Design a protein around this ligand. Sequence first.
Ligand code: HEM
Length: 153
Amino acid sequence: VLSEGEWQLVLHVWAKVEADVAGHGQDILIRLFKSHPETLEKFDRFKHLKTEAEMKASEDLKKHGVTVLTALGAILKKKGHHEAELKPLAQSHATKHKIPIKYLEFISEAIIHVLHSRHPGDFGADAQGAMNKALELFRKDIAAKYKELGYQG
Ligand code: HEM
């Protein structure tokens, strides 16, 4: 359970992300795909992209980054009371997209790295710890839904 102070750190940096949702979404997906190429293979939509320059040039990738970060921002702003938001997301990611929980750990690392690069003054160690806690809570609650549906592993 995050404290109120932890949530305030999380949402303070998140409000900075929302100044450039699409740039952050590109940076995060590109970091994910470069750091963990197995993740790119899960996207029929993107798996033709073979270089970082091609990834940066893809408008469709930039659009999907906005989709992802909009969904995540709506979850963070619930401060833990996010059951309604996680149901469809766990269902699609477990049963249609076939995304292991471990790949959610990978994208969480990419999000933290990009926030640290773009917002160092609002993403000191206290805020890094709080965002890690928030992303852990996200993964815990998604993993419980995966387990229900027979996909935790
Ligand atoms: C912060 C974590 C993530 C969030 C908030 C998120 C959110 C979303 C949303 C909102 C959609 C469209 C609606 C839906 O299908 O449910 C989507 C689609 C999808 N996501 Fe995620 N996602 C996350 C992580 C991942 C990861 C780590 C992967 C793969 C390694 C992945 C793979 C996919 C795929 C394959 C689609 C379908 C893309 C298409 O063909 O249109 N997601 N995601």
